[PDB]
Amino acid sequence: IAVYGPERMQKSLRDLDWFLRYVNYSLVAGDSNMILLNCLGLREILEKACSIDATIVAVQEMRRAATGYLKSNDDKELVGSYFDVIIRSLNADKSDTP
Amino acid sequence: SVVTKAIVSADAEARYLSPGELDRIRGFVSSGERRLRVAQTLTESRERIIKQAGDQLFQKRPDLVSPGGNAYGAERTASCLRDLDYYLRLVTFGIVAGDVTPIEEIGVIGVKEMYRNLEVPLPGMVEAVKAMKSVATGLLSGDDSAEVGYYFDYLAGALA
Amino acid sequence: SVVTKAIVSADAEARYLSPGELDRIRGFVSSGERRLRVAQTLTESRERIIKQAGDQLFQKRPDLVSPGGNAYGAERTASCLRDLDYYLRLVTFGIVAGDVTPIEEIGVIGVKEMYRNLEVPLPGMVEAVKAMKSVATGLLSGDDSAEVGYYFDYLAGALA
Amino acid sequence: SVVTKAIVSADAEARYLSPGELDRIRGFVSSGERRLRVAQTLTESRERIIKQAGDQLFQKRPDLVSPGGNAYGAERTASCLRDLDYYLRLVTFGIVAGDVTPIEEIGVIGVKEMYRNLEVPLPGMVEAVKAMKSVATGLLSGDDSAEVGYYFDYLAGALA
Amino acid sequence: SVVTKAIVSADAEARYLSPGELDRIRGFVSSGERRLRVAQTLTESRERIIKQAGDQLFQKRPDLVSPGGNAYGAERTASCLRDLDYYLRLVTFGIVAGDVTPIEEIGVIGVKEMYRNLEVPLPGMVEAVKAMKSVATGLLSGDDSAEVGYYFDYLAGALA
Amino acid sequence: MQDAITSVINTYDVQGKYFDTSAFDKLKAYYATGELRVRAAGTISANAATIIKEASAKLFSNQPDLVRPGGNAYTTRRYAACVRDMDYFLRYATYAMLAGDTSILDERVLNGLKETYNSLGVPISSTVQGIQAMKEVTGSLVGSGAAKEMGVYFDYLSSGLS
Amino acid sequence: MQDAITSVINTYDVQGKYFDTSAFDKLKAYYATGELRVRAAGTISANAATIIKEASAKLFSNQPDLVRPGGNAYTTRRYAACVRDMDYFLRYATYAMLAGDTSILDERVLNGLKETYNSLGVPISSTVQGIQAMKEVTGSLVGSGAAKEMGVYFDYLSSGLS
Amino acid sequence: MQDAITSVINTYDVQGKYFDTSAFDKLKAYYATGELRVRAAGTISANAATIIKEASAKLFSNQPDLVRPGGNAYTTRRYAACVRDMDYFLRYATYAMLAGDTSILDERVLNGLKETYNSLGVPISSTVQGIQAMKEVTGSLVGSGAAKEMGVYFDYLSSGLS
Amino acid sequence: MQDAITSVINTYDVQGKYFDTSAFDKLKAYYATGELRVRAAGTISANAATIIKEASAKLFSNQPDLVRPGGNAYTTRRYAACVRDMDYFLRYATYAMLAGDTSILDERVLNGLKETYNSLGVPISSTVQGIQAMKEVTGSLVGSGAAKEMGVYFDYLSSGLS
Amino acid sequence: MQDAITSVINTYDVQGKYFDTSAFDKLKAYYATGELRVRAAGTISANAATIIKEASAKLFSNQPDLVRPGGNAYTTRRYAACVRDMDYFLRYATYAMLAGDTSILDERVLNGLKETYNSLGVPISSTVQGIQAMKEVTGSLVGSGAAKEMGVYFDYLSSGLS
Amino acid sequence: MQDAITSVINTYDVQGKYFDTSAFDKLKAYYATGELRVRAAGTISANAATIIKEASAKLFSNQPDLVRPGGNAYTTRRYAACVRDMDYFLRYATYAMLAGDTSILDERVLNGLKETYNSLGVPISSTVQGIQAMKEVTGSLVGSGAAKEMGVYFDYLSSGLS
């Protein structure tokens, strides 16, 4: 935390809250399209002042946590897909953004 | 090339070459000898340029040859250096042609989605071509260096 | 203009200027001194050029100033010579511009419609601009005469 | 009318009317007196043509005025006769115009959608138009009957 | 500005500038440098002036920050001090302009209706401006403070 | 568009009435005038280029400013655009004369033209003077009756540009 | 109506920023050229009638058809209105030069001027020629630097009209 | 669009004049700066991504509300649109600097921009702040004289939006 | 366009917070009516032609002058255009009912409707009456529970015209 | 102007008929709603300045760009102009509500407002947001029944601007 | 559509090799011939009208039956088509001479032309004779050194049509 800085830490926390909030919004809307589109260019924004591996680990952690509370196979797989879209977009932007 | 673009532009309006177009072709053919000098000097020292281009690329971005990187492995690093060789050869072709249309037709159109299929990071490509530009402009004189570096900056912008 | 042409060519496909476009702009601004010298000579000698060109045109084609002709009369001969002054001014404009764009935008678009609305014979205009090319390139040196002749010859072909 | 068709055909081509078109207007205005007489004959006999056409239609198609029919009832039969009156007026307009353009603008465009929204059978309309054709062409002479019959034929084809 | 005001006065009378406006403009441009220094003095130490003036205002009128007052709360107090910042910037604009035209145009026209919609007490604004004037005249040296006071005076008269 | 026959058909269709004596008189009037209209139309079609030449020469002789540097008709392109406008005015005046009605002049020439000239900076007074010159030139070639008839539509164009 | 100082004030107000070094540089440049501007404005004010007389004479000599019958400057009232317009152009060019900005030209002179002249029938090219006549006449009286300064405003008027 | 050469050609074409000494002085002055302009344009083409990135960083640091919820940069989509507009402004400033005239800035960028942004909800003031950030970044990379020249066009864009 | 879900999501996204109790209440209310609204939309989709038939019959019985000469619906073309407009209103009311929002009505109907009906001379009051007639017919066809939901959007259209 | 009773009177006058059952039903509907209209009108007249205050505060909180430097509402003058426009909108919406017809909104407010705003540079989107803010502010004050009646007139103003 | 430079670029890129000394010499040859190529192209652009004049005259002189009724060129349409074919052939020959390669003839001239003439029945012999008529004349105007260069391209067109 100390080397990362307060401003970057605020950005990281609000971004985790952001991922969770669009997961909720996508579940309500019925399509994960907002997550997909807002993640199809996020990696190159993040790389210089962020760790993409750290972000992928964080999104996997939220996926596991949210899957924990559901206690239903279909709900678990649906939320897992809505987090897999984040992971997949981050992995797809290994080269530049489309 | 300059002649080809001028001919295409004239053919677009179904007309002859304009006095300005004849002048631009005249300027191109007048300085062709210096372009040949530049291309010959770049070609003669290709293996150096490639080797230390890889050197600054890998020292500036150790993660590429770090485990999990795109360039890890002898074969994958060899393909890295071969891509650098391709682009140096394309730059020499552009020097000869007097414009960047060989770079366009060979190695720019569709480069992004190709390196998307290859997982190849485009910032890594930009750093590699910038190292190539620094070295090549270093071997050449400043008057040459400016026009040689313009093609490399073009390639870097295309990859970026 | 050459610069404007390069900029619009770059802007068409949404990019910064290519090395070839920068090279042609560099060549254009490198030739500014001779362009200004030639335009200065033509402006300095506008009266002499128009006088001699009108004389040669009217001697070669007496029917224009013959009764029943288009240029018959002092006022119509004055209009005839005023047109030559117009086109000499446009040629100087195109010389400083580096291309025939001012010439075309001022005195080539719709010129056939205009001269058909005036009963002005197009072959007469071709002969007039050819004579004015001869007179003008007579004054200028060998290297500059060719590049002025390119402009005059474009204008002649445009009228023809 | 004929003049309007010729003028719009020339206008959409950015040209003056051709001599063939001017011959069209000449021949059309030559036959003006006959067309006016035909229209006057039909206009003076409107009330009799409506009743005879209605009688012929209902005798040929008793279903329309039969119980459960579309024209069954006094008001519906009156509306039927009113439609016949409209189309007779339209035929007179087309006669004076020299083409089916008034019939097409006032009575043909959207007629099928109209009568579908009014659950009015189209075969009944065609039979009514044929009946009115018979009644109206009965009055006129052979040459005038041949002219009016074609307007009624266009109406019948439009309704079918 | 002084120049704009003189031009407007001349235009209202449809006359060129007389020696009076011309030499007052000469005086204004001669004294522009010291006006720039005075503006720099207030610009460099703006936050000191704002904080001191806010403190003095709340001392004189503690009811503004008291419960039920308009400045109650940290956010509303911040908005108060931001308004004071606005007016300080406008006063520096007036100093560099040499006239109260920027102050009047940006912050005096419609100030009553705006502060009425916000329910801001105009008298409280008056003591705020007076506190700002006291501080600014404190920082400035000698005659300079004089003219600065004038601007503040105008602003106070503008708001009361 | 709308012509005299179509105009009568429309005015009797709106009110729902059949043709009466007055309508037949109007139709007969148009039918009688038709032959003269066709002769005039052919004459103007054959001589349109000459009419434009003479009217343009008249206008630019009276107002040389329009073709000198700084004038609206100063270039080959702006001059050609001017003579194109005059050609269109003449052709549509011929169309309206042949139709017998001024509907085409409204919908197809004048609807939006004056705002177009205000945006472009075209002098509309000079344009109306050129239209009047076209009227004067056309009348001599068409004769007295066709001159009155075509002057009706030329004046309609001039007043519409106003 | 904004001068250079007002323009800087506005570009700093719209950003909400206080003045910094660049703004002081711009205002210092204006204060440096202010003395030249004031001297030129005084010279033009003292010699305004002479400038108008010389320029009107030159224009009517180059285009004599204006003051002859059938020209737009043929009557006492129209000649008076012509020299009145030249007085406008000179006075407002003096204002724009003193302010250092061409805003007063888009703002009090050239707005709707083309439409006004086109409605009146005033020649535009001839008016541009008169504006030049004033430019060459004024340059000689004001000297080389003041002529270079006033030329931008005279050319502004000419380009706006043309 | 037009460059300095075309601007001089037009200002002498509307007047019906050949190039005089002042015109050749202006053309020579433009030709003198051509190599500097080409060098600056090539440098900015080489460093466009760096300039856009660091200027966007400066803007979003000084305007944190833009990227927070409710701000007009709050999503990756909306952020990407912002940085594309930044690329627009830098590219057209480079074009204008190379041409030597602000005609392209008014024609292809500034015209209709405020209306488009008002329709979209974009904050014009923050866009001006981003443009000033562009100017600050670009000056260091291009050097003193090129910084003055390119800052002229960034100021023109800012004043057009402001 | 928007729907109820998009409106709620944007309301809570611009603030930056998760769905509160009111959000879940609105979503529950929207979802509860969903099956009734889908049944109504299917009934209207299968039976649009009928609804248009009785609605137009009621309108033209209440106002016969519309379909008599001199009425805006007196022609086969204008009658067809009238019933086509009725079909637009029915279909867009169905779209809005399914969306739960009136955004589609503002975007794709009311934008340009007043200009259209004022240019064409269509009576706006009679159009409001026709929309009301479609309201009663649709309510009779789809049941009272769906009748209220559809009448909300029919009333929106009616108040948009008048 | 015109209200609901005058609307019925005018349609029956143009048709030249005495009142039928439908006219009396419309009049009875207006008489039923009139007392609620009067209550709402008195409520809004009492709380006009308040309603304007919260609506403007809400709009400038949702769109802080307007009041900040470089925003259309950034000046004492421009802010006061915005508040004046909002007061006009509220008063004329109250007039329309009490009348039962939106004709006064068409004539006094909407006929010319779009062109005025487009020439002034006012953002029409933000103005529609301000009208919606007034709508939702006044709905809580007038009560649900009166809120439903006032909403149609606020929607009418919003659609007229859009 | 490739010149000599692009031709060697492609022949070296396809094998994946860098330029050799022989490649540099072959480039040197074209760079040396470029000036005479440009001069020949300029003279050809100058006289293209004249070569078309004489080529049509000579072709219709040596073969009489084409212009006469029943001939391959017997119409004003077919006459214009034939002269246009000569114009396009000569322009493309000039293009190929500038480029120094015959690829442009394949990719814009012989691309579908041969079977087009076969379906149209155009006599290949007459076209080939026209090509000799064109080149034997153009060689005189361009000079022997440029004549031999134009010869290969004209012969290539002949062999393609043959």
Ligand SMILES: CCC1=C(C)/C(=C/C2=NC(=C\c3[nH]c(/C=C4\NC(=O)[C@H](C)[C@H]4CC)c(C)c3CCC(=O)O)/C(CCC(=O)O)=C2C)NC1=O
């Ligand atoms: C839900 C859809 C969505 C997300 C998440 C999103 C994130 C996002 N984070 C940003 C900044 C940032 N984001 C981060 C890092 C954070 N980023 C996270 O993925 C990590 C968990 C974490 C660090 C480990 C940092 C350090 C910044 C500061 C600016 C920079 O990186 O250059 C920005 C650029 C705008 C700004 O500078 O404020 C975006 C667009 N945008 C979206 O439309």
Ligand SMILES: CCC1=C(C)/C(=C/C2=NC(=C\c3[nH]c(/C=C4\NC(=O)[C@H](C)[C@H]4CC)c(C)c3CCC(=O)O)/C(CCC(=O)O)=C2C)NC1=O
């Ligand atoms: C002349 C036009 C042209 C180009 C440019 C081109 C690039 C190219 N590089 C490839 C492999 C590769 N290229 C690279 C190099 C990249 N990855 C590293 O991180 C660096 C950042 C960067 C080089 C500086 C690597 C690591 C591979 C191996 C990828 C794989 O095998 O999946 C491949 C896959 C096919 C093969 O290797 O034979 C292509 C097509 N091909 C072309 O026909």
Ligand SMILES: CCC1=C(C)/C(=C/C2=NC(=C\c3[nH]c(/C=C4\NC(=O)[C@H](C)[C@H]4CC)c(C)c3CCC(=O)O)/C(CCC(=O)O)=C2C)NC1=O
């Ligand atoms: C700057 C672009 C430009 C050009 C070129 C131009 C040409 C031009 N030439 C004109 C007349 C004329 N032009 C000519 C010249 C022709 N007579 C002979 O046939 C010769 C072959 C030939 C001259 C070499 C003559 C004789 C007239 C007088 C015709 C007349 O007034 O009846 C006119 C009409 C002037 C008027 O209103 O009286 C124009 C506009 N105008 C322009 O704005």
Ligand SMILES: CCC1=C(C)/C(=C/C2=NC(=C\c3[nH]c(/C=C4\NC(=O)[C@H](C)[C@H]4CC)c(C)c3CCC(=O)O)/C(CCC(=O)O)=C2C)NC1=O
């Ligand atoms: C000038 C162009 C035009 C036409 C043609 C036209 C026809 C028309 N016919 C109508 C009704 C009718 N039309 C008919 C006629 C049908 N009955 C039988 O089935 C026959 C097949 C057929 C006649 C031969 C009948 C019976 C009605 C009354 C039906 C109803 O009550 O809706 C109506 C409904 C309003 C009214 O009754 O006045 C129209 C508008 N309207 C126009 O503006």
Ligand SMILES: CCC1=C(C)/C(=C/C2=NC(=C\c3[nH]c(/C=C4\NC(=O)[C@H](C)[C@H]4CC)c(C)c3CCC(=O)O)/C(CCC(=O)O)=C2C)NC1=O
């Ligand atoms: C979904 C958005 C949309 C709307 C709203 C719309 C309405 C619309 N109605 C039109 C015509 C028309 N609309 C009507 C409407 C009828 N007149 C009667 O009096 C009734 C009161 C009323 C309906 C109950 C009529 C009669 C016309 C023909 C007008 C004419 O052609 O002169 C037209 C002109 C184009 C055409 O004729 O097809 C439009 C654009 N179009 C659209 O794309």
Ligand SMILES: CCC1=C(C)/C(=C/C2=NC(=C\c3[nH]c(/C=C4\NC(=O)[C@H](C)[C@H]4CC)c(C)c3CCC(=O)O)/C(CCC(=O)O)=C2C)NC1=O
């Ligand atoms: C550049 C010229 C200019 C000025 C001056 C200006 C004043 C101004 N004052 C405001 C609010 C305010 N202004 C004040 C200041 C008051 N507090 C105490 O009562 C004092 C009597 C007084 C200051 C001495 C306060 C407390 C508010 C907040 C009111 C609220 O939040 O409702 C606001 C609204 C800010 C927003 O909505 O975000 C503006 C625009 N606007 C301008 O464009």
Ligand SMILES: CCC1=C(C)/C(=C/C2=NC(=C\c3[nH]c(/C=C4\NC(=O)[C@H](C)[C@H]4CC)c(C)c3CCC(=O)O)/C(CCC(=O)O)=C2C)NC1=O
């Ligand atoms: C740019 C490359 C190119 C060219 C030049 C070309 C020419 C060409 N000539 C055509 C007809 C024609 N071509 C010719 C010319 C032929 N007949 C005789 O005069 C001569 C032997 C010979 C001249 C070389 C003629 C006379 C016609 C019209 C006769 C017909 O209808 O068959 C056509 C058919 C379509 C049309 O004319 O609009 C084409 C496409 N096509 C191309 O892709």
